Amino acid sequence: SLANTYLLQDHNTLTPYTPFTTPLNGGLDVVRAAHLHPSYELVDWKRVGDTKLVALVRSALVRVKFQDTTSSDQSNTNQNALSFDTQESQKALNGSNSQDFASYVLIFKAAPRATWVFERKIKLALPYVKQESQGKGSLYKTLQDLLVEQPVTPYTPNAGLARVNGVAQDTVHFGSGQESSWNSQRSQKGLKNNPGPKAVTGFKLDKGRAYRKLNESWPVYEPLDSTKEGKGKDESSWKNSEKTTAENDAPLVGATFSKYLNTAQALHQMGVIVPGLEKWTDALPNVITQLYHTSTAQLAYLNGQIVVMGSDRVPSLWYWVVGEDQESGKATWWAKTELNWGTDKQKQFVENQLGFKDDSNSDSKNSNLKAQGLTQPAYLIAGLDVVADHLVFAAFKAGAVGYDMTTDSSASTYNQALAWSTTAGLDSDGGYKALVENTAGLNGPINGLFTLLDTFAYVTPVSGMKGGSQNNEEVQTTYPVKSDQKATAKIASLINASPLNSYGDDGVTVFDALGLNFNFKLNEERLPSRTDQLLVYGIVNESELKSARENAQSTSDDNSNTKVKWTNTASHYLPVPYYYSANFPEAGNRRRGVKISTLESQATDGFANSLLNFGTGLKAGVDPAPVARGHKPNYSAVLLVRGGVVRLNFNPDTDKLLDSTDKNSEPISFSYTPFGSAESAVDLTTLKDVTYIAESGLWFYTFDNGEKPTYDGKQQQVKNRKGYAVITVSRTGIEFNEDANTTTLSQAPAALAVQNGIASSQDDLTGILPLSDEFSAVITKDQTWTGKVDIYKNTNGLFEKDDQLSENVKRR
């Protein structure tokens, strides 16, 4: 209809466009209309029905503090350790009312002449964590020792991710010089039939990319090679000397860049508060402040409830479930949200690598998440959407491992993180379930280089119940802590700003990230990792969401260790395409080794690395095609990852994940289809919009080149920050209840991503208007007052410019 309007964003303004391609009015300035400070920036917004508009706003002036010490042994005992630093926020203002500059969810009501009236704002309060005095699991204790990696920027090179390998597990349990007694004593050490004495226990934290505490700050600088430069977790060495070294080597615009990169503009673009680079040398604000600012990134509205989640480029430790009626709402911790990983074994894999837990240990400095009875703490959120009165989400599991707190300089695992490869053994039984439930690396390391005669492999040739001479015994695995040190061990928690648990500069980590581990069977099957490059997805109902709100609103008391249970979720191993790397290795050759530092990236999808996977643009959609009599209409959610499109399938009759009877069959709820060279050329970090067209059942992914950082790591102006590209996602394969007898599905219904024909490298995009099923308008800026309008003909998701109408709509 002509009376219909399309809402388009321009920074803080949402302008209504008519099907004549012209704006109806000056648009709604979300920040000005909500009576908010100029520092507020519109992050996300959703039109709800026809009379509602929900917006998400954040300010670069927000300051967060974590109270670590926990003085006396009484006090208020019910005060949150997490609070907004009003004094620092006022300090930052200096470069008229006192405010914390907290993020808000804004509610607007429709008004005549296609206008919006401000209704109310809901404050996104910090999650709750009780300040102790006690120095029953403690999240407070974990947060005191928690280390978070500096965010991975699009300019982070492969060698920058590479960390020197940790100590072998034979050295850990037998000590230097006594490693030779492995075969005879492994049995009495909880390592019966373990064939990997040389399996790496983790990665060195003395050098490389910064790991910082909640109240510490990440540097703007990052090393080119983490095996050679950087100070890792060593904040003192950075502050005292290495800061000035990086400052001289990598200065900001206004100087060889031989050791470090200045990624200031890349961080600002990721939603990291970089003072002096905001719209309206100084160290960046706290890790805790950066985590708050980045966590208020994406929203969804579901029957009076608003859900807010973090960004896809920085890990988030919490999420919001707030009432529309409420004035404010505290966040729910991800560590207190137990998800279904597919199998109980799959949960065990993630949770066992979180840290060390033993009945004999009760040391307060062994503060890791596992010891505190907490679950997976962080996620790299691909997005969230609502469909059939349910919330659908997808995220990559951020790497969360343990680290040794020891002061003993000569200790085996001193100054190192404890992480290992969890790839299923070469001898795993067939089928999806047998592979994911394979015991290889369940409790500790096992994988490494195994030289079978003159053919190598980076995975164990024996696992599960295929050990011993008779191949019937258990191949045991145990945590990398020496038996005598179990009672006195001090393992804390560490969060990686990527889907990787281990950064160990070795072949096994390369094989695990690139999905290069395959069994030596004619029916060749890819061996899955149960900790690296893990995509987490699911459907969540109102009662599951209500539990998350209730868990957030609980103040210390007796529900401090109570967990939220989302059972209709799953996890899937989703590595980066190996072909994104120029020199990808292959197991089974003739010796001819490729580690992280020697891996060469040939990726053109907006990342200097070819190691870490990334997920963006989750959008749900109800299939327009008719289904069989007595069955609900099908719905799926799609998202873009490095190398292809992933489709998530659900059962509409139960509002659960799409499942089948057979366990040998791959899950029909998950599908990954690799996209072509043309779509691999698209910068996935520049996604500006995702739209689903109900009538056609097609998703449209809009990419804006203006979303790129202004300067690269070597402080050079970024090439092609002009233009746009559009990808169309369509359904493929047999659908659920497609016909009368379609009961169970053998194959997972897939998606297909293609560059549709709407592309340019010379103009700034205002937006795209779906004028009809057959036509679409592409609004552009250059200096154009009315905005340059291009008309395209829609041929089932494929587009071709109409020169006749494009000129006609242009010419004055």
Numbering used by the authors: 23 to 117, 128 to 167, 176 to 294, 373 to 398, 462 to 773, 779 to 998
Article excerpt on this structure:
M. pneumoniae binds to host target cells by means of a polar structure known as the attachment organelle, and glides in the direction of this differentiated structure at a speed of ~1 µm/s. P1, together with the P40/P90 polypeptides, forms a transmembrane complex called the “Nap”. In the present work, we report the structures of M. pneumoniae proteins P1 and P40/P90 and of complexes of P40/P90 bound to sialylated oligosaccharides. The structural results reveal that P1 (1627 residues) and P40/P90 (1218 residues) present a similar overall organization and topology in the extracellular regions.
After numerous attempts, high-resolution diffracting crystals were grown from a construct, referred henceforth as P40/P90N, spanning residues Ser23-Val1003 that, by sequence alignment, corresponds to the N-terminal domain of the M. genitalium orthologous protein P110. The refined P40/P90N structure, at 2.65 Å resolution, has agreement R and Rfree factors of 21.4 and 23.4, respectively. The sequence of P40/P90N presents two long insertions with respect to P110 of more than 60 residues each (Gly297–Thr368 and Leu395–Thr462 that are referred as S1 and S2, respectively). Both insertions, completely disordered in the crystal structures determined, are found between β-propeller blades II and III. Besides insertions S1 and S2, the structure of P40/P90 presents only three short disordered loops (residues Ser118–Gly127, Ser168–Gly175, and Ala774–Arg777) and the N-terminal domain from P40/P90 can be seen as a well-defined globular structure with two long floppy pendants. The primary scission occurs between Arg445 and Ala446, located toward the C-end of insertion S2. Structural stability of the cleaved protein probably relies on the large interface between the P40 and P90 polypeptides, with 75 hydrogen bonds, 6 salt bridges, and a buried surface area of 10,480 Å2, which gives an estimated free energy of −55 kcal with an expected 100% probability of formation according to the Complexation Significance Score algorithm in PISA32. Regardless of the extend of proteolysis, all P40/P90N samples behave as a single and sharp peak by SEC–MALS indicating that cleavage takes place only when folding is completed and that a unique three-dimensional structure of P40/P90N is maintained.
